[PDB]
């Protein structure tokens, strides 16, 4: 659990379902 | 003046003078023992009872015992023999060869040239190494710093750079370490032996060298910094030369202070440092500077406590230099050395102004690719690569190439990748960068870019990989 | 067509909600490291 | 005498314990044998804590201390411009002494409540990512944030260079003077910045006060606010001035150094509980005035250096809670080819249009609203296997508009040439354009309209807007150059 | 009392007194100084000397300096003289009008409403505002956290609020600005004066200014509150109003105290707040409420620290608010004004128990249609809007209508928008709403709704739209 | 305290006390429990290994004699099996005839429970290995200050044979209830604590202790002391604070992982985070050959073998980077207690960095090992002993080799 | 409440405690309800603090389990010999996030003898009482 790392994580999932939602429609 | 140890607690000693105290950075000799104790006068506690720092062992130390004000602070033997000598914090050789005949004698403690002293020349410093000069190059007279967490390059960096060019550097050298590893001093001074820029015999010496290892107290960790600085300015400002100085590792200056801190008496700052982390590393690098008189190439080795860049002492250093070669264990854990991260190295010339548009737009061209390729890292782990544009899995592909051109076999580092080490010219790098962001190897395989010099390299490399 | 429409839709809202545990793991951990922090000040200030 | 001199009872890490002194008022200036100054920051039952402005070696218990009765004040006026002082106004530039008439005291009130009128006249730098979408007026305070290295001093620099369009000029009341405050610096990169002044003739107009490295904690603690002073001359004569603080950072170490050593309570990070009010007393004293007062203004880029863009750390926090807007800079746009490194979405101007041009606004407004919805769209790009072309038009409009947003170092523009090049890509000229000649065509484009079109900028400057006919007239100029450019 | 000042570490004075000692909260008069300083007593160190907080720069102070103990704590002027006249934090005025000439004077630290004053019943506080009054219902006496900064009209809605409080309620309200950055108070000034809240050649004035600029110490910034509450419970406890207090913004009061707790040297508790975070807040908190006497109600303006809704700060501060007033850009962005989140902002209030069945259930109508188009909005833009059902597409429809049935003239900005301002009433607020829901308007038209008061402005906006 | 060979076989306390009630220790010479390290004159670079008879250890992070190399890892990921193989397998040369080749070694032991530590002494006897062991014993419920001493204590006795020309081996286990020990001390004098509760001077502590381990030149006797101290990660985190002060002072790390202890890495070392900084320097000729360039393979291999976690169109470049990188990593498997000559070590990484197993299934590797290095034993032992006296692998030797393991490859996977 | 001095807080529960007692103690049956126990620790943690006693994990002082566990040791069923009497008691927690982990939870949840979690989830869904019931026990 580093401030660093979480960030990272959240960085490439908001892109994931960023990316992800616009395939589904 | 003679005072008496009132009290010792570890590398701090107060000493009590019944008539004239001894002004701050004094230094003072304990009476009574087989070997020099020099104690550092650190503070005025009041009624004429001084706190100091000793630069060596306190045992044996008895309360009570002689102390001798040897009215000023640590002075060394400064000038040309100094050269191809092993220096102590204190100016006393430990290389067994006789006394330091020096002409004159230099305080340790000075202040730093002025703001109408200073230089602004600034030329590139090409060092044969393929990450280092595309993208963040070194500056002849500026100020250098390779930063790293423990066992991720910093030391070899620096005897890569050493080699490549201090040896032919026709100027002198003077190589400090601060709170490094014995075993280390042992194997640079028998290296600098054996290809002459120590000479035991003649006066080809061109390199002085000052220890104050890991094995030492907090006191001397404290000080050889400022020995081997002392030893440098001479040959900047009473010869006029250009001098090339090297610190491994400075960040040893700073922890040496942080470990006696609390003796004296002070509120820690953050992250355990002491209050005055900052000023104590100001008077200091003031000093590690090219001036009008002389001109000194500093590359100075930087430990990154915990990995962590932002920890107060790696945090604070960044603003004292000219150029940054940021290394980092998830590069190096890769297997890709020099571990240098590609997209946390600066350098002040990285001017178009200074080297050039080919130069720079090469280097911005590896930069852009690999942040791409940064970015879609933690994506296409999950998400797998399929869905990506034939636009973006170009780019993944040649990142992960040039991610591999970067790495080098360094002729100081044969014991450690099985390989012959090579140096690249500046224009052997900024080509063979070209071409692979040019599209111009997209059919060689990643394997023929790693651990390779120049790019024809890669070319023969995927042939013998062809099979 | 009505398979992926259908992984994709699941698929966006785990990630929405490792969003919001993420943020809010990395609030608890912002504000422990402070406190924390500042407590080891504080004792070491303290023991003078 | 106790009363008007003391002795020094202990010395250490720059602070001195001085014994009688029972006259000093709090903050007074005292003096040690030796000739070196200090300044009574903690006034005890028992002692003075001296704050030693120079090298400790030259105290000794016992040393005596006398009072100066006066309080810390400065050079101040016209004579400063083009000179590098410390933070005590002496000059540092060896070019002799500065002749100031006037002095004024460091720290001084802000003007009040009453005494101002809102931020009305354009602060221009000369960058288009600034100017048409966080833009600065005068009076304002707005701070430039971001980690190391990700260009903040450049903004800065590029700012004050850009002054000389209207420093050479003779309307009086579009001048602006630049101060310059570097605290914690090197010398070598504050030397390195007055000659790239120089070298653009922006020092005739600049003020340079400098606290490095080297220098006590205490002298880098003033620093700032002895410039403050410096630019109060010219706000309250009717004079617009501008001061750059680099870094404010830096000084609350500096501070927080001073106050750990006389033994305050430590606070988060080890600052003191009185660090917010060190620079929100600094950076309040930045205003419009009114008329009644000079009409005169202060406008303050200061400087916060984060960590690993940590916003909200304790000073990266203070600061953006007093001041009126943040550039906030990035890593990741830095290295992506965004330069400056502006993140536009989280970058603001509590002043805002307050402070644009008529020109600026006819483009700014809508060239904001693209972006900001391309960012809704952006992330998709690299994965858009089959999008619709309404969106697949926002991306492209997203790419283009982000490359004019794109600029090279010391080559700030004149608002005219902004907003000719900006009217280029909004209103669509540069969408069959290729993303990677959007920095050749503006360049090139922005040759022509320099050289053969100054007529027309001429216009646009005057009117101060795009009249139906200039609109007309640049419409056939871009359209033609854009033949040309494809040929 | 006649004391000496002992010790001067930054705006922490220690005085001396040699016969007669002040008690904690006095304020004390420091004597020779070009302007008032008053210090305020914190604690009894023991031998005749106390420990007091400068309320102003302690510059220039003197060991032996002479100080008048005041006998009591920080009084200032309170009543009818003050609306509309700006005050420093021991009631002094700083808008440069004269003296503040009031009759009574009114220490500011004071204690709060004895359980036997409490009012035992929850009764909603009309503003007029549709938005407000139908979704998210001010309690009398009780506190709402508004969120929301620039851009979204918050300066306006403290306005129009109160200008409603005057009309609707003859209530007064109160303008505590704590850490006020001065270039934006002499910006809400001016603003409210154009507005006219505040008459400068009348006595008309709505409004007391309170003010705690950001260069104030420390302790001047801890009790600017205070002194705003010490104004407002007058119009209450006085006058027995319904007056409208406005804390901008309660974070930065909460900052002040820690600033003052850690020069008290005392050991900061978790995330480095005060050890006495609850207490500080609460000794505040308490004092605004509904007495038999009247109500002050709180709209407080919150700062959440790095966006954690669970620092240390923000928890304590939830822990007294019946309601939140969330102002959002998206919503603006509709052009919608006021624009606040129907489906964000809340309140403690919004019970059938409370606000009556019919009341609840308009609202909980409200909010779920709302909710339904919102999850629709992705399917439209994509897909395109038609596998919509006869029902889907009515959903849509009256959700659109709603919207902007929810937007709303205020009469705080005639002097601008060139229209009318309107203070809608609660039942026309359900009818109107109710109306909707129930299909009466479907026939009527998005636009015959934006911008309008009572439904029956809808339906005349319809004939005007032909 | 009491130092020299009167002590091997012994079990002391932190101060030199006999604790297995065995008599007294018939000492005539002492030592002081601090003394400064011999500095740069007196020392030659570490140039002859140190043979743990773990292949892992020995081919990719090799440890020469003077040399510091640390053992770290979380709870049970088997730091201290690394050290009893070591010490176990230095039987060979102390049966043997060379006193150059022999190694004593010293086993401390620090805030450890007792029942563990007489285990640890039983099966070193069993193995006939106390006769040339020292066990200075500080455990958990030993004062303070008796663990805090005992890494001095053991050093000390240790030098014994450094200053003699002989050579001695020493394991600090584990320098972690050390550091607790001395922050105890410490705290209880009043001293300020500084970073994570520690005195300020917690690197010294350690530093100070370890570069006591060295290497003499030939005017000093040769003689050398080698050292193994242990620290405990938290959390598998190397990068910690005390981690990362030890890692600095010695010369490289053995990282143990438990996901690869779990995994069925046994050892768990982590190739890509372990390193000596004395490389193939102490080495001998055999094994610099076969081990040369694998360490940066197999680093290389790991990242790849991440990189395709899905087949991305992978070339065959890659593919024979995963087909070695699984094949090698398999050979550097191992038990306990059975450490192998060096010889033994060259003939199975032999078989694998050659290619000869790249077409074997990964599964078989390791009972591979065991039949094909059971051949070589018990037939050639010519091709062993030349190639372990050689030292190194003349061409017909690696002809003799190519010959066996390709035959009986071949008759293996019938 | 919230206006009085922390020592009043801190003190309320052992009072009220005391009066269940006596029904406890005379074969009467009596319910105590502690709301919350939340804020008696912090009370007690502003006086700890003010003491200067050394802050702990979230600066909260050593003896905080104590201050809970020796006041609901009290409630407790006696048996016939003593009365048959009893004292139930109901303290409450305030989790921030659904946190149960925290110092403070942790504590109370290893003193009483099981919990009921409400959570907001269930709360806004419409799920009220909001009881978790997986989670929660007895």
Known sequence: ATLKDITRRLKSIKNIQKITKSMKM | ??????????????????????????????????????????????????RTIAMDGTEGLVRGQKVLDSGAPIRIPVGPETLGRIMNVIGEPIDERGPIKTKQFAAIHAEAPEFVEMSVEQEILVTGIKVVDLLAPYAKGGKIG????????????????????????????????????????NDLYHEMIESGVINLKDATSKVALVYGQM????????????????????????????????????????????????LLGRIPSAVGYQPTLATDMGTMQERI???????????????????????????????????????????????????????????????????????????????????????????????????????????????????????????????????????????????????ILAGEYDHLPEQAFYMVGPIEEAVAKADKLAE | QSARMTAMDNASKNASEMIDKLTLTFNRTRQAVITKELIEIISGAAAL | ??????????????????????????????????????????????????????????????????????????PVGEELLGRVVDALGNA?????????????????????IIPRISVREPMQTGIKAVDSLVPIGRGQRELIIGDRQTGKTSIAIDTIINQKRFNDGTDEKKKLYCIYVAIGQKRSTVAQLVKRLTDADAMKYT???????????????????????????????????????????????????????????????????????????????????????????????????????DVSAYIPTNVISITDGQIFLETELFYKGIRPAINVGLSVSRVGSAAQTRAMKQVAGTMKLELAQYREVAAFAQFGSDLDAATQQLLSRGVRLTELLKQGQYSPMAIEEQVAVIYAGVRGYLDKLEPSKITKFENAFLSHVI???????????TDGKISEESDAKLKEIVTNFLAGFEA
Do not use: W
């Open chain 2, 215 to 262: 094995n030492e107290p907090p006191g001397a960790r404290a000080r050889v910094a400022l020995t081997g600085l002392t030893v440098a300015e001479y040959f900047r400002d009473q010869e006029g030369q250009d001098v090339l100085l090297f610190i491994d590792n400075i960040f040893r200056f700073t922890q040496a202070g942080s470990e006696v801190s609390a």
């Open chain 4, 1 to 74: 005498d106790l009363e008007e001199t003391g002795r020094v009872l202990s010395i250490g890490d720059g602070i001195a314990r001085v014994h009688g002194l029972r006259n000093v008022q709090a903050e007074e200036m005292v003096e040690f044998s030796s000739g070196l100054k200090g300044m009574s920051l903690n006034l005890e039952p028992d002692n003075v804590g001296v704050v030693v402005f120079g090298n400790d070696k030259l105290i000794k218990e016992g040393d005596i201390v006398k009072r100066t009765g006066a309080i810390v004040d400065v």
């Open chain 4, 207 to 309: 003020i340079v006060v400098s606290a490095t490295a080297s220098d006590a904690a205490p002298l880098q603690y003033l620093a700032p606010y002895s410039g403050c002073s410096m630019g109060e001359y010219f706000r309250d004569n009717g004079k617009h001035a501008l001061i750059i603080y680099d870094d404010l950072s830096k000084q609350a170490v500096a501070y927080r150094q001073m106050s750990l050593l006389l033994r305050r309570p430590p606070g988060r990070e080890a600052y003191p509980g009185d660090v917010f009010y060190l620079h929100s007393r600094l950076l309040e004293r930045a205003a419009k005035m009114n008329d009644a007062f000079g009409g005169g203004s202060l406008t303050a880029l200061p400087v916060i250096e984060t960590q690993a863009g």
């Open chain 4, 92 to 112: 540092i530039d060896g070019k002799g002494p500065i002749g100031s008439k006037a002095r004024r005291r460091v720290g001084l009130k802000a003007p009040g």
């Open chain 2, 1 to 50: 003046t003679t005072g008496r140890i009132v009290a010792v607690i570890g590398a701090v000693v107060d000493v009590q003078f019944d008539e004239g105290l001894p002004p701050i950075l004094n230094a003072l000799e304990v009476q009574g023992r087989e070997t020099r104790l020099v104690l550092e006068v650190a503070q005025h506690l009041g009624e004429s009872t001084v």
């Open chain 2, 146 to 185: 390779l930063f790293g967490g423990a066992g991720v390059g910093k030391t070899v960096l620096i005897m890569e750079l050493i080699n490549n060019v201090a040896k032919a550097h026709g100027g002198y050298s003077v190589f400090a370490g601060v709170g490094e590893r014995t075993r280390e001093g």
């Open chain 4, 451 to 461: 050289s053969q079109h100054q007529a027309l900028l001429s216009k646009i400057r």
């Open chain 2, 289 to 435: 500077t090219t001036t009008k008189k002389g001109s000194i190439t500093s590359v100075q080795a930087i430990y990154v406590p915990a990995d962590d860049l932002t920890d107060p002492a790696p945090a604070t250093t960044f603003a004292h230099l000219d150029a940054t070669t940021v290394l980092s264990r998830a590069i190096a854990e890769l297997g890709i050395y020099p571990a240098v991260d590609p997209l946390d190295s600066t350098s002040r010339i990285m001017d178009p102004n200074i080297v050039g548009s080919e130069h720079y737009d090469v280097a911005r061209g590896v930069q852009k690719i690999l942040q791409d390729y940064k970015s879609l890292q933690d994506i296409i782990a999950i998400l797998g690569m399929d869905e990506l544009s034939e636009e973006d899995k170009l780019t993944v592909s040649r990142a992960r190439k040039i991610q591999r051109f970067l790495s080098q076999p360094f002729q100081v580092a044969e014991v450690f990748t099985g390989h012959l080490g090579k140096l690249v010219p500046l224009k052997e790098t900024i080509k063979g960068f070209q071409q």
